[PDB]
Each structure stands twice: as C-alpha cells, then as structure tokens.
C-alpha cells in the first residue's frame, strides 16, 4: 500500500540527534519497517498549495499519517480526490486539522486514529514548570545573570512561592488531572476544577480537588489558573477581557490547551494593567505565531511575567518515541486485518463516531 | 538596647514593594514595633570596611541581625570590638558569615540564632524549577519567541520529559528531602540520593528513595543530579573536572547549596563538551557574581542548557515574611527575658552548642 507521510523539515537539527523521528528526515522511525512489510512511504513536508507533493499523491494513497507539529489540512475537496482512502493517522494528539465531520457524513469507511495518552505527562509538565517559572519570576532573573547584571531586588520584589496558593484548572481530563498531580507535594492553599463532569469521587480525593460550578466563581478565588479543556463553543474566547475583570487582581494564567480559547489582545492588555502578573503557555492563535503577535512583546508593569514558548510541549523527544511506537501499532493493527486498535486511539471507526 | 540591622538597599524596588521586608527601607516590618518598645535601631548595607557603618556601632551593639543576601561578616576582629553583644540573629537560614568556632572555643557569652526551616519550601522549589526548565529546554524555547523567531525542531531536538529519569540528591537533609518529595508525581525511573547518614527507613520508603553509597556511583546512573549538601571539607570543590568525568554523558546538574561545591571552570567546561546538557542553580562562588564569572556565559553546543539565577531562590517574598515574623519571635524571646527560643533556631546560646 502507499503511505503518505507528512512531517516538517527538521534540515541540520534532524542530524543532530537521531531520537527526533517527527520529521521528514528520520520518518518516524518506521521507514525500514514499512519497507519490509511490503509497502510504499511517501514523505513530505509540502502540504500547501494546489501542486503540493501532497496533493499529487492523495489520489492513490491508501494511508496518510500527520502531525500536529506541521499538520496537513484533511479538507473536504481532498477528501473528494482521496480515492484510495483507508486510514488517517495522527502521530501525536490532536485532530483539528482532519475534517471529521464531512469524513462522517461521506458515508465512506476511512477510519482516523491519533497515539490517545502520549502527549499528556509532556503537557502537563510543561504546565507545572510555567506555573513556577511565572510565580518564582524566574524569567528577569536568569535575564540579569546572562546581561552581566546582580540585582536581587529587582527579581525579589515580584517573586513568591507556589506552595500557599489557591490553583485552578479550567478542565480535568488527561492533562488537567496530571497538572494537579503534580501540583499535590507543592503544598498549594487548594486545588479546584471547574468541568463538565465531575471526576470520580477517588481520584477527586487522591489530589485533594474542590468542584467549582461556574468559571466565574473558579477564577474569582484563584492565585493561579491553567486551561486544560478542549476548544469548542464553549470555550472559543472564553478568556476576554470581561472574564479577565473577574481574576483576581495579579493572577497568573498558563494555557497549553488551544490559543483561540483566549482573545489576544484582552490577555494582553490584562497584563499591561496589571489584571495579569504572569502569562504563559506554548499555544498560539493564530499558529505559528506571527512575528508581530501581541504575545511575543507582552510585559507586566516591571517588564516580565511573560513565559511564553512556541508550540513544542508535546514534541519532547520521550513524547516523540511515544508517538512513533503508536503509530506503528496502529498501522500494524490497520495492515494486519485484525483492526485491534486500542480503544481509546479510535477517533472514527470506519467513518463512524 | 541598641541593635544593629544589616540588609541590602533595594532602593526604587523597596517602594514598589512594602511587602520586601528584608531590605534597609523596610526594616524587616520591625521599625516602629522597636522604637515603641524604646530600642534604637541602627539599619544599613554599610558592611565593608573599616570606617563602615557596621563598623562605627559595633563596639556598643546589643544585638545585630544580618541576612545571607547581603550577609555582615561577623570576624573574630568584630566580635572582640563588640563589647556589649549579646544576641546574633540571622533573618534568614544560612550563618558561614558568622564565626561560630570562635564563639564557642573562647566561652563567649553570644547566642547565635536562624529561622530554621524557614528557607526551606522556597530553595526546594526552585530546584524542581531548574529541573524542568533545564530538561524541557524551555530557556531557549522563550528565547525565540521574544526574538521574533518560530523553529521548533530547533528546540524540541534536545527537550525532553522528566519523567522517566534517574534523579540523585547529594544530601538529603531539609531541602534535599522536600526535592524529592515534589518529585515523587512526576513519575522519575527512581529517586537517588548520597549522604553521611542514612535516611530512616519510612522517609526513604515515601519517595521511593535508594541510598547509593559513594557519589561517583551515584552520579554515574544519574540523568539529572542535584546538589543539597553544606559546604566543609568533604565538598569544597566536589564537583570537579575528575567527578564530572564520571556523570553520565549529558546529564543535567543543579546546585542551589553553595557555589563553591563546584568548581565553577571544570562545571563550565563540562557543559561546553557535552559532559553536561545543562546547569543551572542561583549559587556562585565569589558571591555577587562578578561580570566575568564563567557561568554567565557558558552554554552547551546548541547555546542553550544555561538555568542560571543570581541568589535569590530563598528570599521569594512567602519568605522574607517568614524571616521578618521569625526575627520578631526571637526578639521578643530576647526582650522579655524569657529566652523562649524555637529549639530548632539555637545555633549557639550563650557559646555553646545544646542537643539537636
């Protein structure tokens, strides 16, 4: 069968270390593998436009495997063209650039997998770790040091501790739930959760979490906030400068879930006023960020309390062999016949929810 | 009585912030609680040199209080000068600028006491801070994005999960313990650590910890190794280019102790080899760090791998009000004559040394 693969180009650093299989020069790994089993592997970083290497080979291809890290728009016209289509694979998490729905409603059997589990420890460290980088000031400090300056005042005088403080989780799925984990040893004042279900009642207990029943009173309370929920109506410009008048005065808010659940510029403008002390996150909208992004230059009033990264938590190189081993078990399932997918890797069965 | 307080200038930054205690503008909160109780309080950073204000009271100071952030060097010289001490307070945890052997080997009638304890949450943290930003080379990552610049392969080629690594502690006293307990959810391979005394057997048991006998086998297994010990005899100049031969080929190496544990040349040209993936810590030795010191500049080959702070990790503003209230507490334990003391604060009462 044609595969076709679709990763960025990592150019010299895909040669710098071996271990980075998301990209067009390592191919996951997995290239000599599907050699062996028979089958012919497209890759490519080229996904944009009408002549796109792509797009010449969707016509025949039986298996497309994407990433969110570069991510190849499964649109409805490709769809159409796609006419060898079996399977969609996402090496990673995350789907939003796959059009499930009109996958569904073709009536075709396309099933669409993504590796369920391999990004959240990824994410949620990377949470915890912008938590107390923004609390801790940590930012300006290691700024002094590299700049030939020593002014501990300067770093003091807007630097806490994380332990005493009230921590709140919009979300406690996968990542949500993780983050408070690793939060219970920090002795925070509380935990809370707002979400649309609650969590069982033990693994409520195991971390110590308090329920809140709207976002408004969750925030109203918080020291700090972490968004961990999926982008969906409800959540599209959740954070806007109206919810942003009902933190409390010099929060700090960390969000790894989906740029477009905040609006830009109201975040923005939260921290110059000092509605915000801290903003951090890896997750951007629009994405990749442009160079004049309102989040890039973004300061609090002493000129920190910006802990943004670009969008690479869940592309660590230990997330990266989680993905590639996934991928493979999955095309393995797929060629074998047996279709004995982990259920939790199911997106669409056979172009059914 | 007359007390001498000894703190840095925070100067604009001290009027931002009324709640940065520890500086001379702020006077610990203590000021007007002292004045009322009809002591004169003396408060400068003039701690150098012989015409030093420090210096111009000495000779009739009650009591003098200092802190490790901009610490008065209490000499044997100062201590013969100071012929109506009686109390020496550290608002703070740390007392190397203090000489406690001359104290105690003379007889001299001082105590000497610290907020024990009271350094301990905010050191601890810092260190699982260091931890992750080294491990997921966040430094770089925010580096970009403040540049104007998009490459993730760039950063994600050396990022990687804590989880799943071999952490080792040299010392495994307060901090070093509190480290590893804010590690157990992280889901580490295993816990290490290396001491001159075991661990009981239930402290070890909570975070899964496996006592390694020396350091290089310790080092040796170890993905990211921090450091948690005093300085003496056993590790001045520990980690040095011989040790560092000896860690595992790139691992990541914290140290929020005390600076001269390392030698700071062998540690800077580890990381630029690759023995090292990163350092990182807010301790050096001198201290301030001059503009030259070698771990402003290092890096390792990808011009990352570089978490270094200047000291502040235990002066986070929890707790310079930690330090502030337990200065007052002694204090009070002083004036009333009661002598009260926290057992766990005693360094030394009246010279000598009591049971632990």
Not at 164 to 171: C, L, R, V
Request: aromatic share 8%; net charge negative; glycine share 8%.
């Amino acid at each position: 069968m044609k595969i076709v693969l679709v990763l960025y180009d990592a150019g010299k650093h895909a040669a710098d270390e071996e271990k980075l299989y998301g990209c067009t020069e390592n191919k996951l790994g997995i290239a000599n593998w599907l050699k062996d089993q028979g089958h012919e592997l497209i890759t490519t970083s080229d996904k944009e436009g009408g002549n796109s290497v792509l797009d010449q080979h969707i016509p025949d291809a039986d298996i497309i495997i994407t990433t969110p890290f570069h991510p190849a728009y499964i649109t409805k016209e490709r769809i159409d063209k796609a006419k060898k289509l079996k399977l969609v694979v996402v090496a990673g998490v995350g789907s939003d650039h796959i059009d499930l729905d009109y996958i569904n409603q073709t009536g075709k059997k396309i099933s669409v997998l993504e590796v369920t589990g391999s990004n959240v420890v990824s994410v949620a460290e990377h949470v915890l770790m912008t938590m107390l980088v923004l609390v801790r000031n940590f930012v300006p400090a290691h700024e002094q040091i590299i700049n030939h300056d020593w002014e501990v005042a300067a770093i003091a005088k807007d630097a806490y501790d994380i332990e005493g403080k009230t921590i709140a989780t919009i979300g406690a799925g996968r990542i949500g739930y993780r983050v408070l984990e690793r939060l219970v040893p920090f002795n925070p004042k509380e935990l809370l959760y707002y979400d649309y279900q609650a969590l069982p009642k033990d693994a409520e207990e195991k971390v110590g979490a308090r329920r809140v029943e709207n976002i408004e009173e969750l925030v109203a309370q918080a020291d700090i906030v972490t968004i961990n929920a999926p982008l969906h109506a409800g959540t599209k410009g959740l954070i806007n400068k109206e919810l942003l008048s009902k933190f409390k005065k010099g929060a700090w808010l960390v969000n790894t879930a989906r740029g477009a659940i905040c609006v830009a510029e109201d975040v923005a403008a939260a921290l110059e006023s000092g509605q915000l002390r801290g903003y951090g996150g890896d997750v951007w909208f629009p994405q990749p960020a442009p160079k004049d992004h309102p989040w890039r230059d973004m300061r609090n009033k002493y000129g920190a309390g910006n802990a943004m990264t670009p969008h690479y938590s869940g592309t660590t190189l230990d997330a990266q062999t989680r993905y590639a081993e996934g991928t493979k078990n999955i095309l393995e399932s797929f060629f074998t016949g047996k279709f004995d997918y982990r259920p939790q890797d199911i997106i669409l069965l056979n172009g059914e929810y």
